[PDB]
Design a protein around this ligand. Structure first.
Ligand code: NA
Length: 207
């Protein structure tokens, strides 16, 4: 019900068609139990201007709204979510936020969907990938994207929540590998304590 309660709060407080309003409403509700990380995500999207962006993990649609609102007209955000109920909520959130024309929601397991992206969603390569699904899928899905030929030179991976709860196996792989150039972004609580972070890993090719 929680995700449904997040949606219900947005519907009562946010302005229809105003993606920023929606983000702010979600942040206000969730705080009771992120905008700071938001600036990092926004900066990566604005620097790289991806035309085709794959999001792994949709949840309530917060990250889809955040990213989609900064995309160019014609850009595509393809979001994979394993839970149909979370997908239904994400669709309603992106609809309310006014960004639905950019978004393709796909329900299923990333393991099964990734190898079908080219054929079923007419993808050639991805410009960017946002990893925010189950932490222990970050590494296997990164390897799968590479194996499937979906990464090109300069494709940006941005992985959220890499410190808390953490995706250390992913971090060790992309940092150690010569195939990825990595940058760590710290997320601060009250501008004082580093409580989480994101990793940006740019693909350089298999070698
Ligand atoms: Na590396």
């Amino acid at each position: 019900t929680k995700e449904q309660r997040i949606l219900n709060h947005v519907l009562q407080h946010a302005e229809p068609g105003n993606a920023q309003s929606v983000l702010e409403a979600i942040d206000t509700y969730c705080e009771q139990k992120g905008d700071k990380k938001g600036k990092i995500v926004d900066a990566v999207i604005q620097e790289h201007q991806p035309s085709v962006l794959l999001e792994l993990g949709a949840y309530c649609g917060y990250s889809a709204v955040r990213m989609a609102r900064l995309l160019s007209p014609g850009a595509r955000l393809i979001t994979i979510e394993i839970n149909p109920d979370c997908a239904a909520i994400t669709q309603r959130m992106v609809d309310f936020a006014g960004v639905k024309d950019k978004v393709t929601l796909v329900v299923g397991a990333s393991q099964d969907i990734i190898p079908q992206l080219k054929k079923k969603y007419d993808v050639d390569t991805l410009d960017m990938v946002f990893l925010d699904h189950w932490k222990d899928r970050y590494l296997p899905d990164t390897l799968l994207l590479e194996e499937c030929g979906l990464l090109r030179k300069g494709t940006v991976l941005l992985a959220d929540n890499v410190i808390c709860p953490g995706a250390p196996d992913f971090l060790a792989h992309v940092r150690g590998s010569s195939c990825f150039e990595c940058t760590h972004y710290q997320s601060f609580l009250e501008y004082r304590e580093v409580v989480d972070g994101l990793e940006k890993a740019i693909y350089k090719g298999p070698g």
